[PDB]
């Protein structure tokens, strides 16, 4: 019941907006947006949890922290200690950004990404083991300022006002090769794996299939397992335990619907009853802990039946591309098995998701005024995303060793392939076609603000550069 280093946590605070109590998790995307914001869940629907998870890298005494800055395993957190929080997706560190604001930082160097933990009452004192459930205050080592909730909109910053934070645990040490919540994986049949159709399909990407060939290597076949409760969501998964199954790139949720049936659904419409599935050992008729709990489901070695909780219907096929359905009896061979996605692929599918949504928002903004002359564009965000993606696809230096280059090239081609198979080229291309409708920046300003026009030439050059980087090699 104590926080150890290498544990995964989310930072929660509490607020009562519109006469309603809500728990707010610190969140940031990283790529395209360094600034942190608060992912709110009230009591009603699944949240964007992936970008909330932080990892306790280190917990240091101020003497030991001072030595590390001056110079070039699962420790317990003690009050008074300084910590380093690594963003699970972005891989960047939670830090105090100058001009002071709170967001993600590339480098762990300096004191900007370090935070001291202090007791929130007389119940705890310095040198005491930090306990799960405790309220805390966090102090920026760089600016001696409080991690603090701000208020129409609800923001995060670093002011001299105090805010009480919970470090709600997600996960801790697990049994090797066991399925935990929040894991990104593939569900395998018989080869065939569960997926939605490729980008730009007549599907609208709403339908679910069993499909073989090369999908087993594509982003569209990846899913995130999400248990209903936010606390200890990264714990061992158990047979019969309710969970939501999220498509990573689409951000939609496997669901049962009254009219459509088994489909994928918008997060906003992910009602618990429609969205709740569980793994069954068998098709027979048929107490929550606060820890990792017992290890029940093994990657690859475990054959699982998938059931919809509310209706008891089995995930089966209609009957190499096959339509996945929910059925009362299903088939003798409905048993799937699970394989864990590795991190690079996992990270990439999320970047795709963030990037798709951002550029679509940008495109939707452009159509808003195409015909009309005389909803602000995400100029700052689009620019940053572009530059990040350029650096993400940047090819290895010729100075690097040949042996390492081959490996770095194969990774690059693989990253590139994933974005490609998800319709990223068409996406970049459409931004360019829309923008090129305008002959000059001045022409652009006629339909968009002159303020936006100041970055018009920059966005296009960056878009082109991305295009080259997606294709190159």
UniProtKB/Swiss-Prot annotation:
Boundaries of the shown chain within the full protein: 12 to 532 of 5037
The MIR domain, residue ranges: 74-120, 127-170, 176-228, 234-292, 294-342
Miscellaneous section: Binding of [3H]ryanodine indicates that the heterozygous channel is activated by Ca(2+) concentrations 4-fold lower than normal. Single-cell analysis of cotransfected cells shows a significantly increased resting cytoplasmic Ca(2+) level and a significantly reduced luminal Ca(2+) level.
Tissue-specificity statement: Detected in skeletal muscle (at protein level). Fast- or slow-twitch skeletal muscle.
Record note on modification: The N-terminus is blocked. Channel activity is modulated by phosphorylation.
Organism: Oryctolagus cuniculus
The protein's assembly and partners: Homotetramer. Can also form heterotetramers with RYR2. Identified in a complex composed of RYR1, PDE4D, PKA, FKBP1A and protein phosphatase 1 (PP1). Repeated very high-level exercise decreases interaction with PDE4D and protein phosphatase 1 (PP1). Interacts with CALM; CALM with bound calcium inhibits the RYR1 channel activity. Interacts with S100A1. Interacts with FKBP1A; this stabilizes the closed conformation of the channel. Interacts with CACNA1S; interaction with CACNA1S is important for activation of the RYR1 channel. Interacts with CACNB1.
Outcome, altering residue 300 to R: Decreases threshold for channel activation by K(+), caffeine and 4-chloro-m-cresol. Decreases inhibition by Mg(2+)
Family the entry assigns: Belongs to the ryanodine receptor (TC 1.A.3.1) family. RYR1 subfamily.
Location(s) in or outside the cell: Sarcoplasmic reticulum membrane
Protein role: Cytosolic calcium-activated calcium channel that mediates the release of Ca(2+) from the sarcoplasmic reticulum into the cytosol and thereby plays a key role in triggering muscle contraction following depolarization of T-tubules. Repeated very high-level exercise increases the open probability of the channel and leads to Ca(2+) leaking into the cytoplasm. Can also mediate the release of Ca(2+) from intracellular stores in neurons, and may thereby promote prolonged Ca(2+) signaling in the brain. Required for normal embryonic development of muscle fibers and skeletal muscle.
Domains (record comment): The calcium release channel activity resides in the C-terminal region while the remaining part of the protein constitutes the 'foot' structure spanning the junctional gap between the sarcoplasmic reticulum (SR) and the T-tubule. Pore opening is mediated via the cytoplasmic calcium-binding domains that mediate a small rotation of the channel-forming transmembrane regions that then leads to channel opening.
Protein name as annotated: Ryanodine receptor 1
